[PDB]
Amino acid sequence: TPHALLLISIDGLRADMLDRGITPNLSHLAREGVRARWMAPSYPSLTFPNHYTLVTGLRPDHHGIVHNSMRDPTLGGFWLSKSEAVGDARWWGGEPVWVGVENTGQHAATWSWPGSEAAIKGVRPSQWRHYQKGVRLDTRVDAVRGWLATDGAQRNRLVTLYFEHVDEAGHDHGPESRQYADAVRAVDAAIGRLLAGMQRDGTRARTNIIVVSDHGMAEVAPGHAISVEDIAPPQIATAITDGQVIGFEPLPGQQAAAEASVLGAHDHYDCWRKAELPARWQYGSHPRIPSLVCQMHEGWDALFPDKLAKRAQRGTRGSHGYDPALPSMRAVFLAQGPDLAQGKTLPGFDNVDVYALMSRLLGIPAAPNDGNPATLLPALRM
Ligand code: VO4
Ligand SMILES: [Zn+2]
Ligand SMILES: [Zn+2]
């Protein structure tokens, strides 16, 4: 029987948070195994795009999950709480690792990884669910522990686990807040309980473990929110998305007026025609990307006008979705297990490179991807 892979995502865990004395279990895991200095997200530095990049090895411009919120001429609208969009395979390009696993006759079990609610390339994981808010830490940990222990025809080569708590605390209170640190500690402790349970089950010694995040988190101090209609008024363009990556579609005949309003450098953002976006972001060819794309500067939000109004203007908040090269946006990568190196540190690298490692650890042929297989070869035990 080949070694299983446990893939854990801690949404919004910034790379530097491993070095603050608040992650005893993950710090121990990293010392036993391999730790990268940091892992850069792909553009845009948002949840759905990056989780899907992690499991496909494709940049969002290629896999088609180009934002958390999208429009498509054929498929219509997509956003995180539109279940029949999220569950519709036609949105999701490439081949995520769970599809690769199932196609070899092996099985995958997912606790709410973006894309796992669809039948991508026709293939669902063996275990999966519709993601719902407020599930207990023990509920998901005990499920994952179960899925790793299963034998016979329900044995799982791949098991995935996801935590939202650090991201949620970061948005509500900022990454330097006691709330963000408390969430980090809680998730770390839950992971400690999973590891101890795997050891009692005898699954620990035959399971490779990868812990990642999708992106980091930056502070958004009071007064750092504008309206998307400050960028372009609604009669000349429609804001398709708000937040930090702001897509605009000019109204009919209004392309020139929209460009006059939007293009170039502004106080706390910059905008480009999608074909002219900075080359380093490798983004803007996909048809689902709006004609005009604005990038908010680090620490600023641009909101739909009704949100800006209900934004309770008091305290410090957090956001991501900023330039992926920023230190604040850096994510985590660590790995440990029977097939992985021991007491190793790796340079910072791009998240597209994780897929090649996982495909090797899962015994699946690597689908074509945007990563470099060389990058994480040093993570292997030999
Ligand atoms: O769903 V996310 O782009 O806010 O961490
Ligand atoms: Zn996220
Ligand atoms: Zn977030």
Report, as a whole number of angstroms, the end-to-end distance: 20 Å
Number of strands: 20
> What about the largest sheet?
7 strands, mixed
Listed once per kind, the bound small molecules are:
vanadate ion, zinc ion
CATH fold descriptor of the largest domain: Alkaline Phosphatase, subunit A
Radius of gyration: 21 Å
Shape: globular
PDB class: hydrolase
Keywords: Alpha Beta, NPP, hydrolase
Assembly: monomeric
Entry title: Structure of Xac Nucleotide Pyrophosphatase/Phosphodiesterase in Complex with Vanadate
What do you see in this structure?
The PDB classes it as hydrolase. The chain is 27% helix and 20% strand. A hairpin with a 3-residue loop joins strand 13 (264-265) and strand 14 (269-273). The protein has two domains: 1-217 and 321-382, Alkaline Phosphatase, subunit A (3-Layer(aba) Sandwich); 218-320, Gyrase A, domain 2, CATH 3.30.1360.180. Helix 6 (137-149) runs parallel beside helix 8 (178-201) and helix 7 (165-173) runs antiparallel to helix 8 (178-201). The chain is an alpha/beta fold and 382 residues long. A seven-stranded mixed sheet has the order 6-7-1-8-18-2-19, sandwiched between helices. The radius of gyration is 21 Å and the shape is globular. It is built from eleven helices and 20 strands. The structure holds vanadate ion and zinc ion (2 copies). The site of vanadate ion has 6 residues, from loops.
